[PDB]
Design a protein around this ligand. Structure first.
Ligand SMILES: *[C@@H]1O[C@H](CO)[C@@H](O[C@@H]2O[C@H](CO)[C@@H](O[C@@H]3O[C@H](CO[C@H]4O[C@H](CO)[C@@H](O)[C@H](O)[C@@H]4O)[C@@H](O)[C@H](O[C@H]4O[C@H](CO)[C@@H](O)[C@H](O)[C@@H]4O)[C@@H]3O)[C@H](O)[C@H]2NC(C)=O)[C@H](O)[C@H]1NC(C)=O
Ligand SMILES: CS(=O)(=O)Nc1ccc(OC[C@@H](O)CNCCc2ccc(Cl)c(Cl)c2)cc1
Ligand SMILES: *[C@@H]1O[C@H](CO)[C@@H](O)[C@H](O)[C@H]1NC(C)=O
Ligand SMILES: *[C@@H]1O[C@H](CO)[C@@H](O)[C@H](O)[C@H]1NC(C)=O
Ligand SMILES: *[C@@H]1O[C@H](CO)[C@@H](O)[C@H](O)[C@H]1NC(C)=O
Ligand SMILES: *[C@@H]1O[C@H](CO)[C@@H](O)[C@H](O)[C@H]1NC(C)=O
Ligand SMILES: [Cl-]
Ligand SMILES: [Cl-]
Ligand SMILES: [Cl-]
Ligand SMILES: [Cl-]
Ligand SMILES: [Cl-]
Ligand SMILES: [Cl-]
Ligand code: NA
Lengths: 363, 358
C-alpha cells in the first residue's frame, strides 16, 4: 500500500519513545494506505513559529495531515491552527493543550478538529452537576471569548425547556480587551448575588476575574464557581488567584494519555485517507507550498472532512462533530481542593453523570 | 533624544506608503516631540493570507509597532490576517476603508477600529430619511448572511428605540429567482422597500421586482452603496435612492486622518504611567502587550474634529461615527446627488428627487 505523510508536532517535554510505542499498532493499519509518521519537536508557540514550522514541513515533505500537541495553556494556538488548516486545506488535529481548547466558529474551509468537548456539551454537564445538588439558582459571567454566545444560548435553551425551577438571575459580559483602570469589571461583578456562578472565559482571563472577584468577596464560602475545561487547562498549573472550591469540567489527560491520543490521531487521518481512496480512487495532493495557496485553490477542497469525522478504530468511535469537536469524550469533573490541587470528583460517561460526593465536603 | 515609537501600516501601493511616511512626519512637526517621536514602518499587501501574517510579524511587529493602519486593497485580500496577528498581541489595528460589518465583532476582531463605518450603519441614514419623508411603514429585505442580518439588527434597534417595519424578509444569498419572496412583499400594504444585499443579490432582486411591476409609481426603494454599484446599478429601477460614503474609497484621506488620530492617542498614552513597549517580533513571544488594552481605550475615546473625512470619533464597537454620505437618486439612468447626510443631519440640495414612476 502507498504511504501518506503525517507530521506529529510536539511542543514541550514529552516521551517520544513512549509515543512511538503506542503506534506499534502500525502493523495495525491493514487499510488501502499506510502512515509514514514523522515526530517533530517545536519549542515556540507564537504565530510565526507555528506557521513557518508547518509550512517548512509541508514543503520538505508530502504531508496529508498534521497531528499537533502542546503542553501550554495557550488557546490562541487552536486559532492559529484553524487558520493554517483553512488556508492550506490540510487536516490538523489538535489533540492536547492549547491546541485542543475550544475554538468556536472554525472557518468554513477548516479541516481542523479538536479532542475534547464542545461548548454546548460542557454547558449541559454543568447544569447536570447543578441539578444533582439542587443548585437551581445561578448567574453567568463571560468575556467576549468566542463561544460565549453559544454557551449562554445553550444554558438558556436548556432551562427554558425544562420544568425544573431554574432561576438565571444575572448574565454579565466582561470586556477585557480594554484596561480596567476605571474599575468597570469590579462594578459589574458587584452585581452578582447567586450562590452559583458559571464562568466562560480563558484561563488567563479567569485569573484576573478571580482576583477582582476576591476583592469584592465573591470567592469564599457561599459562592461556588464552575468553569469549563479551558479555564482549568493544564491542571498542574494552578494560578494563585483561583479560589479553592472551584469546580471544572476537564479533558486534560486524565485517562486518555498523549501516546494513545497521538495514535488515534494517526489512525483518524490514515483511515479517512484510505476510505476516500477506496471510494474515489484519489486522495488530495499534499500542498507543496503555503505561499502559493491563492493560485492553487480551485484545485483544492476540504473533501477529506466527510471521512475525517466518521472514523472508527479498534472498534472505538472516534467521530467528530461538523463543528470540529470530539463526539463522545469521557469527561472528568474536578475540584480545586485546600492544598490547591485539582482532584477528581466525578465522571461524565454514557451521557450520564456519576459524582463522587453526595454532599460536598468543606473546601 | 526622544523615545522612538513606531507606527505600522499595510497599504495598497508605494504611493500610499509615501503618503503614510509624510503624514507621520507632519505629526512629528505638529506635536511636541522632545519626549516621544513617531516613526513610520510600512509594507504593501502580500498576495495571500499566510504570507501577509508572516509579514506583519517580520516587517512590523519586529519594529515594535504600537498600532497598525490597514487599507482594503482593491484587487480576495482582507485586513483579517493583520487583525488576527496584531490581535494576538493586543496591538490595535485601524482599518481605513473596509466596510464589512463582521469587523465590528469583538470576539473575532478584538482590537480593531476603523475610520469608515460598516455597511450596516447605513441604517442610521435610512432612519433619518424615514422621519424626514414620513415613511412610517417599511418593508425590509435583506440577504440571509452576516451583512444582511447586521443591517436588519441595526435598523430594528433604531425603530425599537415612530416609523415601523411592517415586515422583514430574508433570502438566501445567490438565489436568482426571488419571485416568491417579493410576492410576499407585494401582498402587504406598505410600499416603501429597504434592501440590504451584495451587488449580485441586489441585481437578482431588481430583476424579479421589475417582472412583478414593483418598481413603478407608488413604490419607494431605499438601499445602500453595494446595491447601486457595479452590476446592481445595471438593472436598478429608476427613482431608486441609495448612498455613497463620501471619501469612502480615498485611501490617502484616511491615511491622513488615521495618522492624526493615532499620533494624538500616542501622545495622550505617554502622559500616563507605566507604559510598556510592545513585543519585538513574534518569535518566542506569546504574552500580550500589557499596555495594549489601555492604548485601545485611549484610541476608542479619541476625538478629532477637523479630519479630512469630517468629524472623527468611534462608537462602542470601534466603528467610525459622524460619517458623511451622498444621497443618490437614479434619474434617467444617471446617479444624481440629491443631498447629503452630513454626519448628524440630512441636507437636501437643489436637485429634485424623482421617485419610481414620476
Ligand atoms: C451638520 O449639520 C448640522 C445642522 O446644520 C450642524 O449642527 C449645527 O451646527 C451649527 C454650527 O454651525 C449650530 O449653530 C449654532 O446654533 C446655536 C443655537 O443652537 C440651538 O438652536 C438650534 C436651532 O434651533 C438647535 O438646532 C440646537 O440644538 C440648539 O438648541 C447658536 O447659539 C450658535 O450661534 C453662535 O455662533 C454664531 C456664529 O455664526 C454667533 O453669531 C452667535 O452669536 C452664537 O455665538 C450657532 O448658530 C447648530 O446649533 C447645530 N445644530 C444642531 C442640530 O446641532 C452640524 O454641525 C453639521 N455637521 C457637520 C460635520 O458639518
Ligand atoms: C474581548 S476579550 O474580553 O478580551 N475576550 C476575547 C479573548 C480572545 C479572543 O480571541 C478571538 C480572536 O483571537 C479570533 N481570531 C484571532 C485568532 C487568530 C487566528 C490566526 C492567527 Cl495567525 C492568529 Cl495570530 C490569531 C477574542 C475575545
Ligand atoms: C529547541 O531547543 C532545543 C534545546 O534548547 C534544541 O536542541 C532544538 O534544536 C530546538 N528546536 C528548534 C526547532 O530549534
Ligand atoms: C460513517 O457514518 C455512517 C452513518 O451513515 C455509519 O455507517 C458509520 O458510522 C460510518 N462508516 C464507517 C465508519 O465505515
Ligand atoms: C482624497 O483625499 C485627499 C486628501 O488627503 C485629496 O487631496 C484628494 O483630492 C482626494 N481624492 C479624491 C478623488 O477626492
Ligand atoms: C511604573 O510603576 C511602578 C510602581 O509599581 C514604578 O516603580 C515605576 O517607576 C513606574 N514606571 C513608569 C515608567 O511609570
Ligand atoms: Cl520551534
Ligand atoms: Cl481562516
Ligand atoms: Cl476546551
Ligand atoms: Cl489563557
Ligand atoms: Cl518575527
Ligand atoms: Cl432633494
Ligand atoms: Na472594532
Amino acid at each position: 500500500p502507498p504511504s501518506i505523510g503525517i507530521a506529529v508536532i510536539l511542543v514541550g517535554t514529552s516521551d517520544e519513545v513512549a509515543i512511538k510505542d503506542a503506534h506499534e499498532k502500525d502493523d495495525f493499519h491493514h487499510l488501502s494506505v499506510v502512515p509514514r509518521v514523522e515526530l517533530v519537536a517545536m519549542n515556540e508557540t507564537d504565530p510565526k513559529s507555528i506557521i513557518t514550522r508547518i509550512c517548512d514541513l509541508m514543503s520538505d515533505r508530502k504531508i496529508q495531515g498534521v497531528v499537533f500537541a502542546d503542553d501550554t495553556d495557550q488557546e490562541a494556538i487552536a486559532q492559529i491552527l484553524d487558520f493554517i488548516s483553512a488556508q492550506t486545506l490540510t487536516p490538523i488535529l489538535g489533540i492536547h493543550g492549547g491546541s485542543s481548547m475550544i475554538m468556536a466558529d472554525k472557518d468554513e474551509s477548516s479541516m481542523f478538529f479538536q479532542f475534547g468537548p464542545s461548548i454546548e456539551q460542557q454547558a449541559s454537564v454543568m447544569l447536570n452537576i447543578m441539578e444533582e445538588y439542587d443548585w437551581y439558582i445561578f448567574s453567568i459571567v463571560t468575556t467576549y471569548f468566542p463561544g460565549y454566545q453559544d454557551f449562554v444560548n445553550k444554558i438558556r435553551s436548556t432551562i427554558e425547556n425544562s420544568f425544573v425551577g431554574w432561576e438565571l438571575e444575572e448574565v454579565l459580559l466582561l470586556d477585557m480587551s480594554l484596561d480596567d483602570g476605571d474599575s468597570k469589571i469590579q462594578n459589574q461583578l458587584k452585581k452578582l448575588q447567586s450562590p452559583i456562578i458559571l464562568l466562560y472565559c480563558t484561563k488567563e482571563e479567569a485569573t484576573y476575574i478571580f482576583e477582582v472577584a476576591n476583592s469584592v468577596g465573591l470567592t469564599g464560602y457561599g459562592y461556588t464557581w464552575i468553569v469549563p475545561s479551558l479555564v482549568a487547562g493544564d491542571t498542574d498549573t494552578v494560578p494563585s488567584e483561583f479560589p479553592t472550591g472551584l469546580i471544572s469540567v476537564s479533558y486534560d489527560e486524565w485517562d486518555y494519555g498523549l501516546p494513545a491520543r497521538v495514535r488515534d490521531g494517526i489512525a483518524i487521518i490514515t483511515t479517512a485517507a484510505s476510505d476516500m481512496l477506496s471510494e474515489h480512487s484519489f486522495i488530495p495532493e499534499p500542498k507543496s507550498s503555503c505561499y502559493n495557496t491563492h493560485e492553487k485553490r480551485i484545485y483544492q477542497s476540504n473533501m477529506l472532512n466527510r471521512y475525517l469525522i466518521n472514523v472508527t478504530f479498534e472498534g472505538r468511535d472516534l467521530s467528530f462533530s461538523e463543528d470540529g469537536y470530539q463526539m463522545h469524550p469521557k469527561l472528568v469533573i474536578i475540584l480545586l481542593n485546600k492544598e490547591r490541587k485539582w482532584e477528581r470528583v466525578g465522571k461524565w460517561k454514557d451521557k450520564s453523570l456519576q459524582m463522587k460526593y453526595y454532599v460536598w465536603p468543606r473546601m | 533624544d526622544p523615545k522612538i515609537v513606531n507606527i505600522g501600516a499595510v497599504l495598497s501601493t508605494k504611493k500610499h506608503e509615501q503618503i503614510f511616511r509624510e503624514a507621520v512626519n507632519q505629526a512629528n512637526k505638529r506635536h511636541f516631540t522632545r519626549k516621544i517621536q513617531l516613526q513610520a514602518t510600512s509594507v504593501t499587501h502580500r498576495p495571500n493570507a499566510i504570507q501577509m501574517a508572516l509579514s506583519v510579524c517580520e516587517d512590523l511587529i519586529s519594529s515594535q509597532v504600537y498600532a497598525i493602519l490597514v487599507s482594503h486593497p482593491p484587487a480576495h485580500l482582507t485586513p483579517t490576517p493583520i487583525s488576527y496577528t496584531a490581535g494576538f498581541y493586543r496591538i490595535p489595528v485601524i482599518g481605513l476603508t473596509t466596510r464589512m460589518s463582521i469587523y465590528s465583532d469583538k470576539s473575532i476582531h478584538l482590537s480593531f477600529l476603523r475610520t469608515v463605518p460598516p455597511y450596516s450603519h447605513q441604517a442610521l441614514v435610512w432612519f433619518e430619511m424615514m422621519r424626514l419623508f414620513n415613511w412610517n411603514h417599511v418593508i425590509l429585505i435583506v440577504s440571509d448572511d452576516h451583512e444582511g442580518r447586521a443591517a436588519q439588527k441595526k435598523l430594528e434597534t433604531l425603530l425599537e428605540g415612530g416609523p415601523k417595519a411592517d415586515k422583514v424578509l430574508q433570502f438566501e444569498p445567490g438565489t436568482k429567482n426571488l419571485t416568491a419572496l417579493l410576492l410576499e412583499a407585494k401582498e402587504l400594504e406598505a410600499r416603501v422597500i429597504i434592501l440590504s444585499a451584495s451587488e449580485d443579490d441586489a441585481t437578482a432582486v431588481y430583476k424579479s421586482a421589475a417582472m412583478l411591476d414593483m418598481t413603478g409609481a407608488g413604490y419607494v426603494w431605499l438601499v445602500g452603496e453595494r446595491e447601486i454599484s457595479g452590476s446592481a446599478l445595471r438593472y436598478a429601477p429608476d427613482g431608486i435612492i441609495g448612498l455613497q460614503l463620501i471619501n469612502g474609497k480615498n485611501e490617502s484621506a484616511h491615511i491622513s486622518d488615521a495618522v492624526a488620530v493615532v499620533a494624538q492617542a500616542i501622545h495622550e498614552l505617554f502622559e500616563m504611567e507605566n507604559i510598556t513597549d510592545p513585543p519585538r517580533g513574534c518569535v518566542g513571544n506569546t504574552n500580550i502587550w500589557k499596555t495594549g488594552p489601555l492604548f485601545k481605550r485611549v484610541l476608542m475615546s479619541s476625538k478629532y474634529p477637523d479630519g479630512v473625512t469630517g468629524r472623527i470619533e468611534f462608537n462602542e464597537d470601534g466603528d467610525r461615527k459622524f460619517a458623511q454620505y451622498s444621497i443618490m437618486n437614479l434619474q434617467n439612468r444617471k446617479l444624481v446627488q440629491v443631498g447629503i447626510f452630513n454626519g448628524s443631519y440630512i441636507i437636501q440640495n437643489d436637485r429634485k428627487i424623482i421617485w419610481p414612476g414620476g
